[PDB]
């Protein structure tokens, strides 16, 4: 009971953040019908959460040291649960933006502390391997349940979908309080100036990136904000040289195996993000599956991923992360190749969707556990805070960068085959066939990126003694 | 009985040529101890066959159009059979060279005609697909038989190893005489100047490439012969402009999927040749399996390849050559990755050699049939000669080019890990471990080359109607 409550409590914010993220995507069309926030306002509800999630994440890593990791986990999760209630009673556009900003602040504080808790509470060995498998398991369970919950009761209203995080948020706070021990260490002074410039640089960079498409990549407010991001980043690096208790220990990423590992998760997160988005839009637009049936159809992904994670936890103590990452990616590579050739519209479910999803899930499950263990391998307790934050930050940062290239390929080929860059709701059934072949073509580009990820996975070079022993 | 005698007869030269090559490899050390031809002559027995095999191949493609494809097949195989008897009674170094030259001339005349017989004897449809599988099947049966026969009765004498080709050589002539019909077409005049310059250019290019390492890449006989190859090649291209009945129809390779397909088999053949040479030296030097037990240990490869060829022959009428080539290569990719991580000296047979060999065999067998069908797809009868000759030539030309890069990587890492560039018979068991890990490393570079082959295979764009229908 003590072990089971511990792993469930630690992985709670992974369940909440991913489940809330998918519910937001499902409920975004109906927010437009009610609030009438226009097409400009459609992205602010998504970018508001992302803006402060990425802005405050590096602050949230070191915050667990100077206040405590367990208290930081409850405080961060509690703010998220409260923010979801305010989000579900939004009056207008302004209230919904402030509510989404508050959720990201709560999730920015708690997400790094969740992975840092994995590193600290469970001693290296089978306990950390099992905890890592469960931590990555609830990441996938949340997203599917978001589709099912979002797709199930979105008909009655979109407000009820957001209130569903309150029962889950409260039970995780109850489990965390009654199953985690506040290890009383000496509190460490926070880097005031170092954290201010990091938060300023990250928020400004995200603002410029998000606001570019809306207003223009050279208008002046985009590059103007990017100039402030560059200025803060340079001043942050200069100040961190002589900084005590740094927000980012740059000296730490000189091991020649931390850089390789942290470069791998950066692009591996980009491949995973572009894969979920592309498959999500393809299932929604081409197949027309709807959220409820799409969510119920992805249950085999969760069961398949659970098998891959469970197997890999046992295998990580005998095989190095190098082979397991390549072995898992190899399975995913076949699943995406199969889905790149036999994925026309109207194909049945069992032979064409159950198999590649199940095979791909085991590949993702197998490769996630070794990467997570090697990310948090051999750091300490005074430097595990920021290192966990950077692993989350690089995972999320690689999403838009790779996906931007992929979406350009979808758009380029959709015009080449004959198609329109408008909404799917107006298509000629031949422009819609062009879009069908554009998505299937871009899946090869995602496969090309996955090859590069495996290319630098060959430089990881961690033995299983460092990551999953003692 | 007519179909079985036909397919066995047509692919007989592939059995002879491949089997003879492996027997010469196995028997080379014992030829040295008797004839005492020194290290300089060690390669002249191998390069003499290759020098004239590549030199006369392009002339042998057009030779069936002016004399007859059935007559050319019997004459070529008969000269190979007669040359093997002379090769087995060699008195000294000079006569062994002349005997190997005569074998290559017979193989150069028969090999292009053998693949031309596949295209012309069997109508497009299930007959050609089954004949292609058998044609490729007996290439691998021949290689493994060369190990088993070479390694079995090498003990008594190496001369008996070369006489084993006479019972097989005679029966393939008998089958070809009583199972192939001489389709009486009008004989087409031969290109005199074009064939002469093509033979001169190819022989000089091979002579310069072969004699380079022995004498040096800049001595004057290397670039001097290379100068003759370039002068002949340029003159050959000039006279082929106004050539009636050309030896190489350059205009034919402008379809944008003939170039892609023929570039695939060039580098696909280079990948395959480096894979057998690297695995052959690894098994010989590191594992110390000896020829007889190595040959018996590769019997699962023949059975595994037979399953792959048999499955692919039925699947090629429903799936395009694009997906089958990628599907076959994907299986080979996993086998080579598995062998690149869990292949140390001293590992057992069943878990570490039977599985990667069987999986790799099915992968190669699956990919071989679609490539062969698309290579000979949509040509005719008056241009099938040179097209098949070019396909055999590019397959054989890609071997040394890719293998030169792979061997350079093997050597470089052997020194990096701490090793010696001498023979394996003097090793310190720590320099042999460095060589062991060098071969395992170079298997990754072969896997990188296979990926590039897969990328080019996506541009084939043949439907199954063009290659395996009607
Ligand atoms: C230079 C700038 C750095 C590049 C990224 C900028 C922000 C992306 C904005 C796009 C908004 C929506 C998409 C999105 O972003 O999604 C990925 C992820 C969570 O997914 P979402 O919650 O959006 O849900 C998924 C739905 O599917 C969406 O369709 O968001 C992020 O956190 C973005 C990563 C950046 C945060 C961390 C670092 C920021 C600062 C850069 C470091 C150095 C700067 C200093 C100089
Ligand atoms: C991977 C990082 C490793 C380092 C990780 C180390 C760094 C520290 C963090 C550790 C914890 C994170 C791991 C969590 C598990 C991995 C995430 C995941 O897997 O989560 C499920 C996902 C939705 O949840 P998420 O919100 O997490 O999504 C991803 C995030 O957004 C961005 O990472 O859903 C899917 O799997 C999509 C389906 C997969 C398809 C399989 C292939 C079939 C292709 C056929 C084509 C058919 C259609 C045609 C189409 C054209
Ligand atoms: C101490 C350490 C070191 C010190 C420090 C030393 C210095 C650090 C080195 C950094 C990286 C250098 C190169 C990185 C680029 C990637 C390599 C690459 O580009 O080459 C990939 C290679 C060949 O192919 P290419 O054709 O590209 O090469 C030829 C030309 O590029 C084409 O012209 O392929 C492979 O063998 C990879 C095998 C695995 C792939 C199959 C499975 C998928 C992988 C995992 C996915 C995980 C998903 C996770 C989701 C959960
Ligand atoms: C520029 C020159 C072109 C590049 C290749 C040159 C010849 C390789 C000599 C090396 C001798 C031994 C290895 C070898 O070659 O092996 C591959 C194959 C059959 O294998 P082997 O029988 O050797 O047995 C395998 C044992 O394992 C060996 O260890 O040989 C060949 O045919 C070589 C290909 C070239 C022939 C066709 C075209 C030649 C002319 C080039 C075209 C344009 C020129 C005009 C300008
Ligand atoms: C492929 C061309 C397609 C276009 C073809 C179209 C063009 C026209 C011609 C068509 C007919 C040719 C096809 C014949 C079949 C393919 C050849 C083949 O397959 O023949 C068996 C081969 C020996 O016969 P060959 O003499 O023909 O050899 C090749 C030639 O020399 C050059 O092509 O043996 C082997 O398979 C080696 C073992 C394979 C290993 C599998 C992966 C395991 C890796 C684990 C590593 C463990 C050790 C570590 C190591 C470090
Ligand atoms: C029209 C008119 C135009 C003319 C026609 C075009 C011709 C060829 C150009 C492209 C050829 C190379 C393509 C790209 C490449 O080179 O890359 C492969 C690709 C990307 O990955 P990379 O990481 O390399 O890209 C990194 C960056 O290039 C550098 O950073 O991967 C894939 O999708 C391939 C999927 C299949 C591979 C798995 C199965 C094995 C394949 C079959 C082997 C058969 C064995 C032989 C047995 C017979
Ligand atoms: C008609 C069909 C057969 C055409 C498809 C063949 C090519 C047009 C495509 C198929 C896959 C593509 C490759 C897939 C992956 C990549 C990796 C890509 O790099 C990235 O994804 C980098 C992402 C980043 O910027 O962070 C560069 C192009 C490349 C080599 C692509 C080059 C073009 C390729 C070979
Ligand atoms: C010892 C540890 C640190 C592992 C490090 C190995 C990697 C640095 C190797 C393994 C796979 C290699 C790649 C495999 C194949 C290729 C294709 C190669 O070009 C070819 O087409 C090779 C075949 C040829 O034409 O000769 C260019 C380098 C590259 C990307 C290689 C670059 C170096 C890589 C990444
Ligand atoms: O995120 C997952 N899907 C999606 C991601 C998206 C997206 C849509 C989806 C959908 O699925 C979907 C939604 C409504 C109706 C039909 C399908 O539209 C914007 C970009 O992001 C996902 C969750 C769990 C498991 C696998 C996945 Br692919
Ligand atoms: O040609 C095949 N092997 C070889 C190729 C070689 C080579 C050696 C071998 C051997 O095997 C071998 C020979 C003697 C003792 C032990 C092993 O030395 C020079 C370079 O070429 C082969 C044949 C059929 C199936 C698979 C293969 Br890999």
Author numbering:
A (entry chain B), B (entry chain A): 49 to 518
Please give sentences taken from the publication describing this entry.
EfpA is an essential transporter in Mtb and categorized as a member of the QacA (quaternary ammonium compound A) transporter family. Mtb EfpA is a 55.58 kDa protein with 14 transmembrane domains (TM). EfpA TM helices organize in a typical MFS transporter fold where two bundles formed by 6 helices (TM1‐TM6 and TM9‐TM14) are arranged with an internal twofold pseudo symmetry. Although EfpA has been suggested to play a role in Mtb drug resistance, its essentiality in axenic culture implies that antibiotic efflux is a secondary role, and that the primary function of EfpA is the transport of a yet-uncharacterized biomolecule across the Mtb plasma membrane.
